[PDB]
Amino acid sequence: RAATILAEQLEAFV
Amino acid sequence: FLKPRLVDIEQVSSTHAKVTLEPLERGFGHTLGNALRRILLSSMPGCAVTEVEIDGVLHEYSTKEGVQEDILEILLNLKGLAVRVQGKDEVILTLNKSGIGPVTAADITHDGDVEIVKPQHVICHLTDENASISMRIKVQRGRGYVPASTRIHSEEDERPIGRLLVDACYSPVERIAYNVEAARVEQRTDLDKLVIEMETNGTIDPEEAIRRAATILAEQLEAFPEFDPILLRPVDDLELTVRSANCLKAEAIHYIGDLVQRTEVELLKTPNLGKKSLTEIKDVLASRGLSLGMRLENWPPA
Amino acid sequence: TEFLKPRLVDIEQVSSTHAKVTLEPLERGFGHTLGNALRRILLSS
Amino acid sequence: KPLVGTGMERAVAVDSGVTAVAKRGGVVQYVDASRIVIKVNEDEMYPGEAGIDIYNLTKYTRSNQNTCINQMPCVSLGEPVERGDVLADGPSTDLGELAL
Amino acid sequence: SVITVGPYLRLHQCGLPKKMALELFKPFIYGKLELRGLATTIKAAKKMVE
Amino acid sequence: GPEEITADIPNVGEAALSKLDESGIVYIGAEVTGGDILVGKVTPKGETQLTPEEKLLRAIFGEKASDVKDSSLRVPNGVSGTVIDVQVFTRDGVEKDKRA
Amino acid sequence: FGIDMNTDYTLEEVGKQFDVTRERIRQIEAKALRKLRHPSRSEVLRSFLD
Amino acid sequence: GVLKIVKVYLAVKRRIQPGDKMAGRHGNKGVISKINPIEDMPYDENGTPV
Amino acid sequence: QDVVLGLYYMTRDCVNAKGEGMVLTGPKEAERLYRSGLASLHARVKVRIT
């Protein structure tokens, strides 16, 4: 869930 | 749980630009920013020149008559040549010039995917009226730093001794810096901004780099004995004549295992094999304890 | 120019509330960025 | 080059034979990685033979320590040179100074 | 050879260069290589590590 | 007997004999590493005086044991570079080889 | 050959020791080496040749 | 005794690796320990690493 | 040397700093307070230890 927050933060790029 | 996104991308030069990110929560500017800096510096597509064959040059330690630059100097200059390609992973260019005067990067023949970011870039100078240099500049694409020394292991006949290998400088990124300033969006308690000011050679667009960076970053989150060895050696290890080797390869005989299965009958029925060639093959096979018509039954295992 | 993903992952945990997880193959310099960004997020957020 | 210097490095570089020093002032007729040919000014020139000073630069060769010893031209085609000027740098020398 | 730091090391260990360890343990490597059957004979082992 | 610089070396593959010219000397500009043969050299040693198991081995595989031992100069282990020069010295009166 | 034995014996001597002499023995050897020539037998000895 | 001599001249290019000795002009010696990526390098506010 | 300067700079106190005087359940949230930049490494604090 921690790193999932990270993945959510990147959801507007990749 | 607000996710960030990008905003104005300010290009101040062909060299470098400042990309900005608006919606950043408490402390996330640093967490995202430094991690982005890392991937940005480390892993990025690059097209840096690898192989260079020059005119009369056997090694990089000679000097060509008519040019004040030493050959090693010219290689070192080429390594600093920034080019961008589109459809080709590896293209080869051709450089040609003569007469008195500087040879720039615009003096090369222009190809389909070739884009020269620095036409003024100096490869080498020309000191005499009649003095000419031709070279093939083999430019391939890769990631990270690939020195010339580790490039030779595979080998596989780099015999054209006129070809000097050069260290791979693959990477658009020169300098990356990230500054977080408090960013006030109309209504919100407190949010941060991310100003990533990067430095490039122009061969990569800022949006593209900033994109792939977080692409990879997220991409890491995806997880949170009988018989003779001699039978599998290529026919080239038999060291036959060019003719015999080509004939055998034309008959679908690529390894020693394939050859030792064939009989004299069958080989003589081929369109290109005479008695001399067969004599040679029998000789080289007998010289290593092998022959024709050898059965190994079980071709092949895996 | 394909990339590298980790193929040996093992979580050795002591008791219940404590855990030590390890990941074998990471490209050079990826271990620090991953380790750190996740630590920052884990603690601070 | 030493970024932080003394002012001696120039003397050490030049006084040692590593660098190639102009015998007589003039202009450079030819500048190659191989050789450097200088057309001597008439004042410093002798009456007979006319002549130009041709310096043949030492290229890659074995040193005593099994290092490399090589010279590079620091001058450009058709440049003013003065007597006792550095025409070419030896190994570990920059523009008449000493870069170790 | 010349020595370096290696702070990551535990007190009970030391960093040993690849080539050095190869050359040093050469007989052991031969023996093990033909012990598991990776090498036909000692000669083959020599040729392998060479 | 007299030693030879010839490119004919007992027990070597084509990969080994590739880097040498017809005379047995490595080409200028050819990049080499440890183990590569720089100069093929061979010295006479006759009647090798083998043993029974060796005699069986040879008779099985049909190999003529050469009367010449391989003294060839090869790149020292671990060092890798490019050959920039080759010099051949010959005794006055001895016939110069092809390469020389 | 002299394998695990003192010196070695002429084909005729080997013939005297075998009670069946001359050309006969010369043939066996030829077929013996032959059996050792082909691999799975010869792969072990082959690596001995460098 | 020597009939002929062949001198080959090699040019080897080595850059820098751990174990090499480096020093300033002030009598401060040292040996390169590890070669660190640009990524891990301490950097100023300008973003220029050291 | 480096290590002892480390433990010295770690274990030490200044007169005033972040989190001066506060109280924490144990070393765990002490380090948790420090690493988040909330509390200074050296600050006078009462903590429950076992």
Per-domain boundaries in chain B: 1-41+171-230, 42-170, 231-301
- The values of phi and psi at residue D84, to 5°, are 70, 45
Domains B42-170 and B231-301 share a fold: no
Taking the domain D18-92, which CATH number applies? 2.40.50.100
CA of I38 to nearest chain C CA: how many angstroms apart? Answer: 10
- Judge contact between F41 and F4, C-beta under 8 A: yes
Q: State the sign of the Cα–Cα–Cα–Cα dihedral C27, C33, C37, C39.
A: positive
Residues G32, F56: Cα–Cα separation, whole Å: 11
**CB neighbours (10 Å) of residue F75?**
21
- The values of phi and psi at residue C40, to 5°, are -55, -55
CA of B290 to nearest chain G CA: how many angstroms apart? Answer: 7
Closest by Cα among F89, F77, F70 to F20: F70
F85 touches chain H (CB under 8 A): yes
Q: Do A3 and B221 touch (CB under 8 A)?
A: yes
Q: What residues of A are in contact with residue B4 (Cβ under 8 Å)? A: 9, 12
Tokens 């005067």 — which residue?
B101
* Tally: H helices and E strands in chain I: 2, 2
Name the residue among F80, F84, F94 with its Cβ closest to that of H4: F94
**CB neighbours (10 Å) of residue H10?**
19
Burial of B143 (0-12, 13-18, 19+ CB in 10 A): middle
Name the residue among B226, B229, B289 with its Cβ closest to that of G42: B289
Helix (H, G, I), strand (E, B) or coil at E39: coil
Q: How was this structure determined?
A: X-ray
Closest by Cα among A10, F40, E39, G28 to B33: A10
Q: Number of folded domains in chain F?
A: 1
Give the fold, CATH level 3, of B42-170.
Answer: RNA Polymerase Alpha Subunit; Chain A, domain 2 (2.170.120)
- Judge contact between B246 and B282, C-beta under 8 A: no
Q: State the sign of the Cα–Cα–Cα–Cα dihedral F13, F17, F18, F22.
A: negative
Asked, for residue F100, whether it belongs to a domain, the answer is no
Give the fold, CATH level 3, of B231-301.
Answer: DNA polymerase; domain 1 (1.10.150)
Q: Show the tokens assigned to H20.
A: 């090499």
Asked, for residue F99, whether it belongs to a domain, the answer is no
Q: Show the tokens assigned to B26.
A: 């408490």
Interface test with chain E among H16, H31, H36, by most E beta carbons within 10 Å: H31
Q: What residues of G are in contact with residue E43 (Cβ under 8 Å)? A: 47-48, 50
- Judge contact between E48 and E38, C-beta under 8 A: yes
Q: What is the dihedral of CA B232, B238, B244, B245, to 10 degrees?
A: 50
| E44: nearest CA partner in chain G | G47
Q: What residues of B are in contact with residue A5 (Cβ under 8 Å)? A: 1
- Judge contact between B259 and B291, C-beta under 8 A: no
CA of B76 to nearest chain H CA: how many angstroms apart? Answer: 14
Q: Which amino acid is at F35?
A: G
CA of A12 to nearest chain C CA: how many angstroms apart? Answer: 18
**Domain span including residue F26:** 1-94
D3 touches chain H (CB under 8 A): no
CATH classification at residue F83: 2.40.50.150
What contacts B6, CB < 8 A, 6 or more positions away? A12, A13, B19, B20, B21, B22, B207, B210
Asked, for residue F85, whether it belongs to a domain, the answer is yes
CA of D32 to nearest chain B CA: how many angstroms apart? Answer: 4
Q: Do C37 and A6 touch (CB under 8 A)?
A: yes
Q: Do E47 and G50 touch (CB under 8 A)?
A: yes
Give the fold, CATH level 3, of B1-41+171-230.
Answer: Gyrase A; domain 2 (3.30.1360)
